[PDB]
Amino acid sequence: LNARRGQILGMEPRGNAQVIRAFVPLAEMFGYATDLRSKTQGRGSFVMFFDHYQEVPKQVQEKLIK
Amino acid sequence: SRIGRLPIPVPKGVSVEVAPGRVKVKGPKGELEVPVSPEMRVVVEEGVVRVERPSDERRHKSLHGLTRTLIANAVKGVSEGYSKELLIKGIGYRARLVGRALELTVGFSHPVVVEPPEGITFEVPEPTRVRVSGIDKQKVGQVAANIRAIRKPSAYHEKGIYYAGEPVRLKPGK
Amino acid sequence: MLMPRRMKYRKQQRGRLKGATKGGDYVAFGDYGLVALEPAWITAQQIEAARVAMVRHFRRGGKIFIRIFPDKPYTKKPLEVRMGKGKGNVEGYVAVVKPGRVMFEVAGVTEEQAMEALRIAGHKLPIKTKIVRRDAYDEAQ
Amino acid sequence: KRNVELLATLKENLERAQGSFFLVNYQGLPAKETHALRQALKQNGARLFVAKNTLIRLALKELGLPELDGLQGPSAVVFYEDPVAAAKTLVQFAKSNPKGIPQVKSGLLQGQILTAKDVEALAELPTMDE
Amino acid sequence: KKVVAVVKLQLPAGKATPAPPVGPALGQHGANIMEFVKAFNAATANMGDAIVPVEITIYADRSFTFVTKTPPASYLIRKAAGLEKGAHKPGREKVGRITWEQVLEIAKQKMPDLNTTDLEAAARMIAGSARSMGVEVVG
Amino acid sequence: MEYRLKAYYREGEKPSALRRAGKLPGVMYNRHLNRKVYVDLVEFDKVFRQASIHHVIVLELPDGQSLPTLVRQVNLDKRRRRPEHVDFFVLSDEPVEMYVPLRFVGTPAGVRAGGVLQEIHRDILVKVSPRNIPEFIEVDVSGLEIGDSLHASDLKLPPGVELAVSPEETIAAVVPPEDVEKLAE
Amino acid sequence: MKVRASVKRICDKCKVIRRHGRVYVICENPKHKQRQG
RNA sequence: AAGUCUGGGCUAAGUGGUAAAGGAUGUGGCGCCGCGAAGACAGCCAGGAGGUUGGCUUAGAAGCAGCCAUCCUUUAAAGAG
Ligand SMILES: [Mg+2]
Ligand SMILES: [Mg+2]
Ligand SMILES: [Mg+2]
Ligand SMILES: [Mg+2]
Ligand SMILES: [Mg+2]
Ligand SMILES: [Mg+2]
Ligand SMILES: [Mg+2]
Ligand SMILES: [Mg+2]
Ligand SMILES: [Mg+2]
Ligand SMILES: [Mg+2]
Ligand SMILES: [Mg+2]
Ligand SMILES: [Mg+2]
Ligand SMILES: [Mg+2]
Ligand SMILES: [Mg+2]
Ligand SMILES: [Mg+2]
Ligand SMILES: [Mg+2]
Ligand SMILES: [Zn+2]
């Protein structure tokens, strides 16, 4: 999660099982299901939703201007 | 602070005979010759053996400790015996004696068979422990090691041949 | 970075680097210093590189004193041209530096901190150096 | 060479405030267990003198130089000194014999003792409260 | 049929949900885990807050036993100094103050937890835990 | 606090010879005499690194004289950072001009704010009898923030012990203090 | 193995050795293994 | 062609008999401070503890992200690590 340019929000239990909430940029959620399944032995899962927009990094922005 | 000067207790009843060039150690379990630099003096005393060096010149101090231990290891060799234990680990993996020979089964497309050199004797007490035993310290070492080398501990799994007492340090792997 | 603001003359003859320093040999301001162990024309960018390195070590911060300043213009002809047809173009500025010169000083910093700082600064310089520390011998001068 | 000087004296002072010093081998008790078996002999032995555990070496130069009967019970090993006289103990060593000889495998085990000014003994000092 | 355990926890006041560390190391009691919401928040419903320590033991017929300590040094001092939080940066901006003799009573609250069994010793721990949060001792 | 030093007379001995010999060629003078001396380097060093130009040093010549001196100069060889020569001033009962250390008592409000005490004088010039040479002179630097200085004009001053430099001579300053944040620009 | 002109202790468990004419740094952590060259 | 010449020392690389920044328990020799039979250095046997998650700061930073501060306690000792 952090390594995907994300920013984590918190952690609660469920079916025990655990849940981890985060804001990651969508640009970094492509094909997530598969790393997630690798990183969790095919035992975890996820849901994901648009929350908001914000300033892409000054080092990303100016690559895009092509 | 010093190995060479540390006297060597000799057990009743192993015997230590000095020559120039060598010292011989005999006991219940065999006999051993230990090559010794002709610059050191090996000294026999009551139920003890000492080693003396001719100066504090670097080579002599270095020879000093080495010589004491070399003789100390022979003393212990013929009296107590030396030995090392290898633990086999991993699901398919096991060993068994076959004559005096050790047949190692460790996940190659074939068993591996190890003939014990002379002075070395193999024990497979359970089927996942092997015991290399012998009078010669370094040789015991060398063979234990040879065996272990047939398939070292993995980086990723508690799997392979291990010195008993040797720690399993892993690293995560996906 | 460093260079005179104005000059009576733009290019100068190359000169020669015989001699222990002329002066500059004793620590004058800080607690720690770095002395040239050998002659060299040290470059504005080399000084700057060292200065910068030092500040980066302290982060914030101590005091850096700079005791050499490059007033010698360094000349060079354009690539691939022949000899003749007048002296080369000023392309930079340098400080003549002879052995025993205290080049940089530091203060307001621990022993550990000034030692390291001057070590790194050394590595940006094209000569041998030693680190020294203030003394009665310095003060006496 | 050293605070071994300021340390001897501080043992002499605390010996020169007595006539009856005992000696225990405060070996492997944890920290929980320790501020217990200590605060124990501070609520059964006056002032704040349970053990003033210090160097066997300096604790023989001190007994030696006050002469204090040459405390040579056994200054070998781990050694702590249950100052029974800078307190007000007696059979208050029972306060030791009951905490150690139950709450461990050999709790606060004893070694030497000098009651009044006279050499106590082995188990005859360790039964000096039974 | 799980083992005789000597558990140590630190849960705050309020949140009495049987989730870690009230889950893994507390299965071994077969614990009336939700008996804690009521046997805790009855000594801490007059208070409201304060993290109150605890040790939770189990035996051989699967039942749990727990006993608690006294609210943090950092806690007690906060609501005698007119503060919710500390002082952000300890040193330059005190955001509260306490007389020599108000630390003493705060100390007195903590007398049965510490190392010393004193006051003049006890009170400086308190006063020392006042620099650690940058609130000056009125003296 | 009043140090001593064997010192010997010399005539024609080449300084190179002496220097090689572990010794340190020197000279002693005031207005009454001028003698050529040598002193063993390592003995000299051990003293002067505490004495400096601040404390009296007593030269024990072979004739059994014991002259009280201040060091007046030490010539360093520029290339190898070492003493080549010393000038011992034979103090007499007159007042003397000399250098008196400054002890900077206090932590500036300027420091403790990120900044740095540029100690511009680590001693100060003074007219004074040898008989009351003040081994110290304290200066409170506590009221200093980044921006401030202190001149000689301040400076308590014992008896007596006058100044010997303009009072308008700045002696200490507190200056701002190297910042990575500046760099990039 | 790292092979360099400058070989140096990297952590506190790093140990500088000389075998058979060459300076090596051996260490518990295999990333610190160095051999000068 | 003429000394396998004489006395002292260093070198172990065939350095000698091809080079720099820089790097290194190579080897020898100086010097300076340090700890040490009131027992040091090395191994090994205990302990290594409270107030306390120190305050702030993220959602969590409970000695060890990072900004401050770095006290107090029992103590033989034990860092706000
Ligand atoms: Mg053997
Ligand atoms: Mg092999
Ligand atoms: Mg020219
Ligand atoms: Mg150039
Ligand atoms: Mg040109
Ligand atoms: Mg350089
Ligand atoms: Mg000048
Ligand atoms: Mg120097
Ligand atoms: Mg010198
Ligand atoms: Mg490098
Ligand atoms: Mg290693
Ligand atoms: Mg010859
Ligand atoms: Mg080579
Ligand atoms: Mg060659
Ligand atoms: Mg060659
Ligand atoms: Mg060398
Ligand atoms: Zn390492």
Side-chain angles (χ1 to χ4, degrees), chain F residues 64-102 104 106-126 128-135:
Chain F
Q65 232 154 130
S66 287
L67 306 193
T69 60
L70 279 190
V71 167
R72 254 294 143 91
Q73 85 205 175
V74 219
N75 285 15
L76 307 163
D77 133 66
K78 274 85 158 333
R79 154 203 303 284
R80 311 181 171 81
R81 198 172 213 265
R82 279 208 297 162
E84 286 193 298
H85 198 269
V86 253
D87 285 52
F88 294 112
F89 196 18
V90 182
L91 266 11
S92 88
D93 58 316
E94 282 149 357
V96 63
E97 236 157 330
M98 60 124 65
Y99 281 103
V100 190
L102 276 35
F104 289 98
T107 69
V111 190
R112 201 218 293 299
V116 164
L117 157 65
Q118 167 142 3
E119 284 175 17
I120 305 174
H121 258 91
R122 279 173 205 277
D123 54 78
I124 217 229
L125 207 67
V126 151
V128 61
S129 231
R131 285 206 297 280
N132 47 323
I133 292 290
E135 297 186 6

Side-chain angles (χ1 to χ4, degrees), chain E residues 93-106:
Chain E
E93 181 207 276
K94 293 86 189 290
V95 209
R97 59 182 206 177
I98 301 298
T99 53
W100 274 62
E101 54 186 34
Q102 189 177 29
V103 1
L104 265 153
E105 59 115 350
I106 291 201

Side-chain angles (χ1 to χ4, degrees), chain E residues 51 72-74 78 85-86 88-90 115-116 125 128-129 131-132:
Chain E
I51 277 210
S74 185
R78 286 201 295 195
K85 40 261 260 51
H88 301 164
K89 294 203 77 61
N115 230 313
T116 146
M125 266 176 32
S129 296
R131 305 213 327 250
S132 318

